mmCIF file of C-alpha atoms and ligand atoms in Angstrom:
data_model
loop_
_atom_site.group_PDB
_atom_site.id
_atom_site.type_symbol
_atom_site.label_atom_id
_atom_site.label_comp_id
_atom_site.label_asym_id
_atom_site.label_seq_id
_atom_site.Cartn_x
_atom_site.Cartn_y
_atom_site.Cartn_z
ATOM 1 C CA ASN A 1 -3.574 -19.505 15.332
ATOM 2 C CA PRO A 2 -4.629 -19.974 18.996
ATOM 3 C CA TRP A 3 -1.519 -17.950 19.896
ATOM 4 C CA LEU A 4 -2.805 -14.933 17.927
ATOM 5 C CA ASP A 5 -6.335 -14.528 19.336
ATOM 6 C CA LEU A 6 -6.024 -15.640 22.937
ATOM 7 C CA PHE A 7 -9.220 -15.918 25.013
ATOM 8 C CA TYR A 8 -11.271 -16.611 21.885
ATOM 9 C CA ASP A 9 -14.258 -18.222 23.689
ATOM 10 C CA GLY A 10 -15.651 -19.470 20.374
ATOM 11 C CA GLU A 11 -18.146 -17.545 18.282
ATOM 12 C CA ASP A 12 -21.243 -15.691 19.458
ATOM 13 C CA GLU A 13 -24.101 -17.613 21.035
ATOM 14 C CA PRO A 14 -27.227 -18.065 18.869
ATOM 15 C CA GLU A 15 -29.380 -16.219 21.433
ATOM 16 C CA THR A 16 -27.342 -12.990 21.448
ATOM 17 C CA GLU A 17 -29.434 -9.994 20.395
ATOM 18 C CA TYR A 18 -26.892 -7.137 19.928
ATOM 19 C CA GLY A 19 -29.395 -4.665 21.358
ATOM 20 C CA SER A 20 -32.523 -3.251 19.751
ATOM 21 C CA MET A 21 -31.525 -0.232 17.650
ATOM 22 C CA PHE A 22 -29.108 -0.430 14.697
ATOM 23 C CA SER A 23 -29.481 -4.219 14.775
ATOM 24 C CA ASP A 24 -31.266 -5.323 11.583
ATOM 25 C CA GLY A 25 -32.124 -3.959 8.159
ATOM 26 C CA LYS A 26 -29.995 -1.709 5.953
ATOM 27 C CA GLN A 27 -28.449 1.747 6.271
ATOM 28 C CA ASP A 28 -31.469 3.647 4.909
ATOM 29 C CA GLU A 29 -33.956 2.157 7.405
ATOM 30 C CA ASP A 30 -32.592 3.598 10.677
ATOM 31 C CA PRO A 31 -35.309 5.719 12.356
ATOM 32 C CA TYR A 32 -33.045 7.270 15.010
ATOM 33 C CA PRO A 33 -31.676 9.860 15.522
ATOM 34 C CA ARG A 34 -34.437 11.933 13.901
ATOM 35 C CA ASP A 35 -34.993 15.663 13.574
ATOM 36 C CA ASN A 36 -36.560 17.554 16.487
ATOM 37 C CA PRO A 37 -37.924 20.864 15.149
ATOM 38 C CA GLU A 38 -39.561 21.518 18.538
ATOM 39 C CA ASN A 39 -36.187 21.544 20.322
ATOM 40 C CA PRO A 40 -35.162 25.167 21.060
ATOM 41 C CA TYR A 41 -31.439 24.274 20.905
ATOM 42 C CA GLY A 42 -31.398 22.162 17.736
ATOM 43 C CA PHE A 43 -30.780 18.870 19.535
ATOM 44 C CA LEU A 44 -32.109 15.817 17.712
ATOM 45 C CA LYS A 45 -34.671 13.292 18.980
ATOM 46 C CA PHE A 46 -32.950 10.327 20.606
ATOM 47 C CA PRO A 47 -34.453 7.041 21.850
ATOM 48 C CA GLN A 48 -35.014 6.365 25.529
ATOM 49 C CA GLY A 49 -31.888 5.124 27.270
ATOM 50 C CA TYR A 50 -29.563 5.013 24.266
ATOM 51 C CA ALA A 51 -26.480 7.219 24.226
ATOM 52 C CA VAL A 52 -26.531 10.312 22.029
ATOM 53 C CA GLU A 53 -23.731 9.160 19.700
ATOM 54 C CA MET A 54 -25.507 6.454 17.687
ATOM 55 C CA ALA A 55 -23.954 6.765 14.215
ATOM 56 C CA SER A 56 -20.926 4.769 15.380
ATOM 57 C CA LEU A 57 -23.173 1.906 16.534
ATOM 58 C CA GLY A 58 -24.042 0.715 13.025
ATOM 59 C CA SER A 59 -20.411 0.061 12.113
ATOM 60 C CA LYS A 60 -19.819 -2.069 15.215
ATOM 61 C CA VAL A 61 -23.132 -3.953 15.261
ATOM 62 C CA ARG A 62 -24.517 -4.075 11.720
ATOM 63 C CA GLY A 63 -21.178 -3.652 9.930
ATOM 64 C CA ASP A 64 -22.380 -0.692 7.872
ATOM 65 C CA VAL A 65 -20.018 0.998 5.426
ATOM 66 C CA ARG A 66 -20.405 4.587 4.233
ATOM 67 C CA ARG A 67 -17.104 5.168 2.414
ATOM 68 C CA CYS A 68 -15.434 2.358 0.469
ATOM 69 C CA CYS A 69 -12.049 2.366 -1.271
ATOM 70 C CA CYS A 70 -11.558 0.007 -4.222
ATOM 71 C CA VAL A 71 -7.887 -0.036 -5.255
ATOM 72 C CA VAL A 72 -8.331 -1.579 -8.701
ATOM 73 C CA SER A 73 -5.191 -2.681 -10.530
ATOM 74 C CA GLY A 74 -4.900 -2.856 -14.303
ATOM 75 C CA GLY A 75 -5.940 -0.619 -17.161
ATOM 76 C CA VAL A 76 -9.235 0.055 -18.902
ATOM 77 C CA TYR A 77 -10.372 -3.578 -19.154
ATOM 78 C CA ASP A 78 -9.999 -4.524 -15.476
ATOM 79 C CA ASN A 79 -11.524 -1.266 -14.233
ATOM 80 C CA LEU A 80 -14.422 -1.799 -16.641
ATOM 81 C CA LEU A 81 -14.933 -5.383 -15.443
ATOM 82 C CA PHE A 82 -14.980 -4.096 -11.847
ATOM 83 C CA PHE A 83 -18.240 -2.227 -12.590
ATOM 84 C CA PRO A 84 -20.560 -5.075 -11.401
ATOM 85 C CA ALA A 85 -18.619 -5.181 -8.119
ATOM 86 C CA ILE A 86 -19.168 -1.434 -7.664
ATOM 87 C CA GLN A 87 -22.877 -1.845 -8.427
ATOM 88 C CA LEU A 88 -22.970 -4.729 -5.935
ATOM 89 C CA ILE A 89 -21.411 -2.505 -3.260
ATOM 90 C CA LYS A 90 -23.959 0.223 -4.023
ATOM 91 C CA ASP A 91 -26.877 -2.228 -3.851
ATOM 92 C CA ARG A 92 -25.731 -4.038 -0.696
ATOM 93 C CA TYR A 93 -24.803 -0.797 1.120
ATOM 94 C CA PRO A 94 -27.272 2.013 0.332
ATOM 95 C CA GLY A 95 -25.887 5.531 0.500
ATOM 96 C CA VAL A 96 -22.265 4.375 0.285
ATOM 97 C CA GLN A 97 -19.606 6.501 -1.417
ATOM 98 C CA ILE A 98 -17.098 4.492 -3.455
ATOM 99 C CA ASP A 99 -13.649 5.866 -4.288
ATOM 100 C CA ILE A 100 -11.337 4.216 -6.817
ATOM 101 C CA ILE A 101 -7.542 4.092 -6.947
ATOM 102 C CA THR A 102 -6.160 2.934 -10.289
ATOM 103 C CA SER A 103 -3.677 3.768 -13.033
ATOM 104 C CA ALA A 104 -3.863 6.731 -15.407
ATOM 105 C CA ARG A 105 -5.579 4.688 -18.128
ATOM 106 C CA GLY A 106 -8.043 3.025 -15.752
ATOM 107 C CA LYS A 107 -9.133 6.350 -14.257
ATOM 108 C CA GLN A 108 -10.756 7.339 -17.563
ATOM 109 C CA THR A 109 -12.997 4.255 -17.395
ATOM 110 C CA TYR A 110 -14.982 5.721 -14.481
ATOM 111 C CA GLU A 111 -16.102 8.676 -16.590
ATOM 112 C CA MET A 112 -19.130 6.528 -17.510
ATOM 113 C CA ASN A 113 -19.817 5.340 -13.938
ATOM 114 C CA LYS A 114 -22.679 6.734 -11.858
ATOM 115 C CA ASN A 115 -21.545 5.262 -8.518
ATOM 116 C CA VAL A 116 -17.940 6.432 -8.050
ATOM 117 C CA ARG A 117 -17.344 9.634 -6.090
ATOM 118 C CA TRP A 118 -13.584 10.105 -6.564
ATOM 119 C CA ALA A 119 -11.280 8.415 -9.066
ATOM 120 C CA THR A 120 -7.589 8.812 -8.254
ATOM 121 C CA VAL A 121 -4.453 7.995 -10.242
ATOM 122 C CA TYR A 122 -1.684 6.129 -8.421
ATOM 123 C CA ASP A 123 1.204 4.119 -9.876
ATOM 124 C CA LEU A 124 0.390 0.774 -8.284
ATOM 125 C CA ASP A 125 2.836 -1.169 -10.476
ATOM 126 C CA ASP A 126 5.832 0.663 -8.965
ATOM 127 C CA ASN A 127 7.293 -1.512 -6.210
ATOM 128 C CA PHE A 128 9.602 1.330 -5.066
ATOM 129 C CA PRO A 129 7.466 4.489 -5.086
ATOM 130 C CA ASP A 130 8.529 8.006 -4.242
ATOM 131 C CA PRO A 131 8.402 8.438 -0.433
ATOM 132 C CA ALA A 132 6.595 11.780 -0.712
ATOM 133 C CA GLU A 133 3.955 10.488 -3.138
ATOM 134 C CA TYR A 134 3.478 7.266 -1.152
ATOM 135 C CA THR A 135 3.122 9.201 2.109
ATOM 136 C CA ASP A 136 0.698 11.687 0.524
ATOM 137 C CA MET A 137 -1.482 8.874 -0.855
ATOM 138 C CA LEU A 138 -1.427 7.033 2.480
ATOM 139 C CA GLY A 139 -2.386 10.190 4.364
ATOM 140 C CA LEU A 140 -5.157 10.910 1.860
ATOM 141 C CA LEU A 141 -6.566 7.416 2.386
ATOM 142 C CA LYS A 142 -6.274 7.856 6.156
ATOM 143 C CA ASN A 143 -8.084 11.211 5.991
ATOM 144 C CA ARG A 144 -10.941 9.864 3.869
ATOM 145 C CA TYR A 145 -11.801 7.456 6.748
ATOM 146 C CA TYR A 146 -12.814 4.477 4.650
ATOM 147 C CA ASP A 147 -15.016 1.928 6.383
ATOM 148 C CA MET A 148 -13.727 -0.800 4.067
ATOM 149 C CA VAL A 149 -10.942 -1.107 1.506
ATOM 150 C CA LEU A 150 -10.797 -3.731 -1.249
ATOM 151 C CA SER A 151 -7.724 -4.527 -3.342
ATOM 152 C CA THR A 152 -7.734 -6.443 -6.615
ATOM 153 C CA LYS A 153 -3.948 -6.070 -6.772
ATOM 154 C CA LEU A 154 -2.082 -9.174 -5.614
ATOM 155 C CA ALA A 155 -0.912 -8.013 -2.192
ATOM 156 C CA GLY A 156 2.416 -8.956 -0.660
ATOM 157 C CA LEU A 157 3.648 -7.723 2.691
ATOM 158 C CA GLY A 158 4.078 -4.146 1.464
ATOM 159 C CA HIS A 159 0.602 -3.809 -0.036
ATOM 160 C CA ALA A 160 -0.890 -5.463 3.052
ATOM 161 C CA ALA A 161 0.888 -2.896 5.239
ATOM 162 C CA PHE A 162 -0.318 -0.077 2.974
ATOM 163 C CA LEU A 163 -3.895 -1.325 3.373
ATOM 164 C CA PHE A 164 -3.289 -1.778 7.115
ATOM 165 C CA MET A 165 -2.280 1.861 7.616
ATOM 166 C CA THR A 166 -5.541 3.001 5.950
ATOM 167 C CA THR A 167 -7.403 2.730 9.313
ATOM 168 C CA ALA A 168 -10.185 0.814 7.550
ATOM 169 C CA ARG A 169 -12.405 -1.514 9.561
ATOM 170 C CA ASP A 170 -12.411 -4.109 6.763
ATOM 171 C CA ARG A 171 -9.236 -4.739 4.752
ATOM 172 C CA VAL A 172 -9.927 -7.163 1.898
ATOM 173 C CA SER A 173 -7.409 -8.086 -0.760
ATOM 174 C CA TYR A 174 -6.209 -10.566 -3.319
ATOM 175 C CA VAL A 175 -2.861 -12.068 -2.327
ATOM 176 C CA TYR A 176 0.007 -13.768 -4.105
ATOM 177 C CA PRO A 177 -0.530 -17.544 -4.509
ATOM 178 C CA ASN A 178 3.214 -18.100 -3.974
ATOM 179 C CA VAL A 179 5.121 -18.132 -0.675
ATOM 180 C CA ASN A 180 5.953 -14.414 -0.929
ATOM 181 C CA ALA A 181 2.527 -13.480 0.506
ATOM 182 C CA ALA A 182 3.303 -14.994 3.918
ATOM 183 C CA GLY A 183 2.080 -12.754 6.725
ATOM 184 C CA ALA A 184 -0.099 -10.635 4.434
ATOM 185 C CA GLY A 185 -3.292 -12.244 5.746
ATOM 186 C CA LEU A 186 -2.404 -11.182 9.287
ATOM 187 C CA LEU A 187 -2.746 -7.515 8.273
ATOM 188 C CA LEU A 188 -5.869 -8.047 6.122
ATOM 189 C CA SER A 189 -9.414 -8.719 7.287
ATOM 190 C CA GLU A 190 -10.008 -11.016 4.306
ATOM 191 C CA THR A 191 -7.722 -12.651 1.753
ATOM 192 C CA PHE A 192 -8.374 -14.225 -1.647
ATOM 193 C CA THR A 193 -5.996 -16.601 -3.410
ATOM 194 C CA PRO A 194 -6.485 -16.572 -7.205
ATOM 195 C CA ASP A 195 -5.773 -19.514 -9.480
ATOM 196 C CA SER A 196 -2.736 -17.855 -11.095
ATOM 197 C CA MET A 197 -0.133 -15.128 -10.674
ATOM 198 C CA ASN A 198 -2.234 -12.982 -13.053
ATOM 199 C CA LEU A 199 -5.746 -12.031 -11.963
ATOM 200 C CA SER A 200 -6.622 -10.830 -15.477
ATOM 201 C CA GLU A 201 -6.111 -14.376 -16.804
ATOM 202 C CA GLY A 202 -9.676 -15.006 -15.700
ATOM 203 C CA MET B 1 44.503 69.135 -2.442
ATOM 204 C CA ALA B 2 43.050 65.693 -3.269
ATOM 205 C CA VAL B 3 45.102 65.598 -6.502
ATOM 206 C CA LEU B 4 48.191 63.424 -6.923
ATOM 207 C CA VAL B 5 50.598 63.409 -9.876
ATOM 208 C CA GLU B 6 52.858 60.377 -10.309
ATOM 209 C CA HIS B 7 55.713 60.245 -12.827
ATOM 210 C CA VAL B 8 57.088 56.886 -13.986
ATOM 211 C CA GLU B 9 60.181 56.588 -16.178
ATOM 212 C CA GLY B 10 59.276 55.231 -19.597
ATOM 213 C CA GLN B 11 55.575 55.787 -18.878
ATOM 214 C CA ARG B 12 53.071 58.596 -19.223
ATOM 215 C CA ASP B 13 52.516 60.500 -15.992
ATOM 216 C CA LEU B 14 49.207 60.051 -14.179
ATOM 217 C CA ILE B 15 47.004 62.658 -12.496
ATOM 218 C CA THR B 16 44.630 61.131 -9.946
ATOM 219 C CA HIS B 17 41.654 63.084 -8.602
ATOM 220 C CA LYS B 18 40.091 61.621 -5.467
ATOM 221 C CA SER B 19 37.069 62.620 -3.394
ATOM 222 C CA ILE B 20 36.149 60.524 -0.357
ATOM 223 C CA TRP B 21 32.395 61.134 -0.374
ATOM 224 C CA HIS B 22 29.640 59.261 1.423
ATOM 225 C CA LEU B 23 25.953 59.782 2.074
ATOM 226 C CA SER B 24 25.049 60.899 5.574
ATOM 227 C CA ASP B 25 22.884 58.669 7.746
ATOM 228 C CA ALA B 26 20.225 61.397 7.659
ATOM 229 C CA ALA B 27 20.139 61.139 3.858
ATOM 230 C CA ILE B 28 19.805 57.345 4.071
ATOM 231 C CA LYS B 29 16.957 57.724 6.572
ATOM 232 C CA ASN B 30 15.326 60.210 4.188
ATOM 233 C CA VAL B 31 15.584 57.664 1.357
ATOM 234 C CA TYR B 32 14.003 54.981 3.560
ATOM 235 C CA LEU B 33 11.244 57.355 4.705
ATOM 236 C CA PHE B 34 10.387 58.476 1.177
ATOM 237 C CA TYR B 35 10.301 54.879 -0.026
ATOM 238 C CA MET B 36 7.953 53.931 2.826
ATOM 239 C CA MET B 37 5.577 56.784 1.969
ATOM 240 C CA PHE B 38 5.816 55.891 -1.731
ATOM 241 C CA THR B 39 4.931 52.289 -0.859
ATOM 242 C CA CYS B 40 1.927 53.423 1.197
ATOM 243 C CA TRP B 41 0.747 55.765 -1.575
ATOM 244 C CA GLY B 42 1.118 53.056 -4.204
ATOM 245 C CA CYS B 43 -0.658 50.483 -2.043
ATOM 246 C CA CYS B 44 -3.608 52.854 -1.611
ATOM 247 C CA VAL B 45 -3.775 54.018 -5.237
ATOM 248 C CA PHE B 46 -3.228 50.648 -6.930
ATOM 249 C CA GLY B 47 -5.585 48.929 -4.524
ATOM 250 C CA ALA B 48 -8.228 51.487 -5.434
ATOM 251 C CA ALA B 49 -7.550 50.683 -9.100
ATOM 252 C CA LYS B 50 -9.399 48.003 -11.047
ATOM 253 C CA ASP B 51 -7.923 44.562 -11.699
ATOM 254 C CA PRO B 52 -8.339 43.559 -15.373
ATOM 255 C CA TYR B 53 -8.087 39.783 -14.883
ATOM 256 C CA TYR B 54 -9.116 38.949 -11.315
ATOM 257 C CA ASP B 55 -12.386 40.883 -11.673
ATOM 258 C CA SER B 56 -13.070 39.438 -15.131
ATOM 259 C CA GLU B 57 -15.501 36.667 -16.014
ATOM 260 C CA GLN B 58 -12.589 34.580 -17.325
ATOM 261 C CA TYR B 59 -11.364 34.148 -13.730
ATOM 262 C CA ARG B 60 -14.449 34.363 -11.505
ATOM 263 C CA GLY B 61 -16.719 32.525 -13.948
ATOM 264 C CA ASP B 62 -14.468 29.456 -13.997
ATOM 265 C CA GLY B 63 -14.662 29.279 -10.191
ATOM 266 C CA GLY B 64 -11.569 31.243 -9.197
ATOM 267 C CA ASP B 65 -11.393 32.619 -5.672
ATOM 268 C CA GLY B 66 -7.788 33.806 -5.286
ATOM 269 C CA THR B 67 -6.918 30.386 -3.858
ATOM 270 C CA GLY B 68 -4.047 28.442 -5.392
ATOM 271 C CA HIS B 69 -5.873 25.091 -5.621
ATOM 272 C CA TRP B 70 -9.190 26.026 -7.242
ATOM 273 C CA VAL B 71 -8.307 24.508 -10.634
ATOM 274 C CA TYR B 72 -7.730 20.930 -9.450
ATOM 275 C CA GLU B 73 -10.676 21.047 -7.047
ATOM 276 C CA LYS B 74 -12.918 22.427 -9.801
ATOM 277 C CA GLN B 75 -11.786 19.636 -12.139
ATOM 278 C CA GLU B 76 -12.507 16.874 -9.617
ATOM 279 C CA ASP B 77 -15.796 18.602 -8.774
ATOM 280 C CA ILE B 78 -16.972 18.624 -12.386
ATOM 281 C CA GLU B 79 -16.081 14.942 -12.853
ATOM 282 C CA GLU B 80 -17.976 14.087 -9.653
ATOM 283 C CA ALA B 81 -20.872 16.272 -10.822
ATOM 284 C CA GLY B 82 -20.962 14.468 -14.168
ATOM 285 C CA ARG B 83 -21.111 11.101 -12.415
ATOM 286 C CA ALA B 84 -23.827 12.419 -10.082
ATOM 287 C CA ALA B 85 -25.749 13.750 -13.097
ATOM 288 C CA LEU B 86 -25.612 10.291 -14.674
ATOM 289 C CA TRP B 87 -26.900 8.852 -11.386
ATOM 290 C CA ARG B 88 -29.710 11.442 -11.308
ATOM 291 C CA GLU B 89 -30.652 10.657 -14.918
ATOM 292 C CA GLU B 90 -30.777 6.931 -14.173
ATOM 293 C CA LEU B 91 -32.902 7.619 -11.080
ATOM 294 C CA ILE B 92 -35.413 9.715 -13.039
ATOM 295 C CA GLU B 93 -35.659 7.184 -15.875
HETATM 296 C C1 SQD C 301 9.203 13.233 15.547
HETATM 297 C C2 SQD C 301 7.708 13.171 15.376
HETATM 298 C C3 SQD C 301 7.262 12.782 13.992
HETATM 299 C C4 SQD C 301 5.772 12.651 13.851
HETATM 300 C C5 SQD C 301 5.314 12.116 12.508
HETATM 301 C C6 SQD C 301 3.875 11.722 12.526
HETATM 302 C C7 SQD C 301 3.412 11.058 11.263
HETATM 303 O O1 SQD C 301 3.058 9.914 11.189
HETATM 304 O O2 SQD C 301 3.407 11.885 10.224
HETATM 305 C C8 SQD C 301 2.719 11.391 9.055
HETATM 306 C C9 SQD C 301 2.813 12.401 7.935
HETATM 307 C C10 SQD C 301 2.079 11.928 6.706
HETATM 308 O O3 SQD C 301 1.549 13.033 5.956
HETATM 309 C C11 SQD C 301 0.182 12.941 5.674
HETATM 310 O O4 SQD C 301 -0.108 13.938 4.718
HETATM 311 C C12 SQD C 301 -1.501 14.049 4.424
HETATM 312 C C13 SQD C 301 -1.651 14.927 3.197
HETATM 313 S S1 SQD C 301 -3.146 14.859 2.259
HETATM 314 O O5 SQD C 301 -4.237 15.414 3.201
HETATM 315 O O6 SQD C 301 -3.394 13.483 2.001
HETATM 316 O O7 SQD C 301 -2.989 15.735 1.144
HETATM 317 C C14 SQD C 301 -2.164 14.592 5.656
HETATM 318 O O8 SQD C 301 -3.534 14.848 5.392
HETATM 319 C C15 SQD C 301 -2.041 13.552 6.735
HETATM 320 O O9 SQD C 301 -2.590 14.070 7.942
HETATM 321 C C16 SQD C 301 -0.596 13.153 6.967
HETATM 322 O O10 SQD C 301 -0.628 11.935 7.698
HETATM 323 O O11 SQD C 301 4.224 12.585 7.633
HETATM 324 C C17 SQD C 301 4.613 13.657 6.924
HETATM 325 O O12 SQD C 301 3.875 14.345 6.275
HETATM 326 C C18 SQD C 301 6.083 13.896 7.068
HETATM 327 C C19 SQD C 301 6.483 14.202 8.472
HETATM 328 C C20 SQD C 301 7.957 13.934 8.731
HETATM 329 C C21 SQD C 301 8.477 14.516 10.018
HETATM 330 C C22 SQD C 301 9.902 14.137 10.308
HETATM 331 C C23 SQD C 301 10.559 14.937 11.396
HETATM 332 C C24 SQD C 301 12.050 14.736 11.469
HETATM 333 C C25 SQD C 301 12.771 15.039 10.179
HETATM 334 C C26 SQD C 301 14.272 14.923 10.256
HETATM 335 C C27 SQD C 301 14.769 13.531 10.545
#
């Protein structure tokens, strides 16, 4: 583990401030950049000193997410039980857009959900997918530019790589409790080990 | 002249009439030219004509735009709009 992150230098000092703007609060509280109707060229109103491009600062400093991808495995029951997690994402991150990847049966569950933007059908149970369909889904996920991706499917090396190629800042997944999930946590920002080989047993 | 009679023992004789004929290149160019003018005339006339389906409410009312992917996009749009309408209703209440 030292050999992975060389020059670690511990964690951040308690007195670090991370600047002034885009430092505290939530996503809906940011006062800058604001509209400048008096500008003849349509340029916004920016704070003194700060660079013009400020929307990228919240992701680095405050860890804001605007588009989230929840790849929920299972049918109607699991996708229904994932509703409090979706509401939690909406409450914690105001203004976020949540997209769901699930099976054909689980996609119909999100008809009665007020928080999901897109619900997409993808055969997650197939361990050997069609190369064209797999590539199309991966490119779609790459082109949505998800800030964070969560996976309730038990992720091996292949699912970890699929989440890795999503270009998401946070890659969070459930992993296999057995030895076959070795190296999956290297490609994921956060890993969860359930108490059994079946997550729906809970 | 261009007629040949062959007799075969034990067989009926055959009279063959032959005429080596071919269209001139000028005639072929005339065919091409007339087909080009017919194509131009038809393009003009049948573009000026009315289109029974693509101008109808059955096509434009559903969201059609001549684009091959409007059906799937319209479907995903109406599901997203239903979810957004539920969100609006929960906000108002
Ligand atoms: C040699 C150079 C190859 C460069 C390939 C780059 C790459 O990663 O392509 C990634 C994209 C993924 O598509 C994906 O397809 C997505 C489709 S969609 O928007 O999700 O609908 C698209 O948006 C996305 O940009 C794209 O990544 O790959 C393809 O679509 C297939 C390209 C295959 C090219 C092979 C060339 C040689 C063939 C003979 C051997």
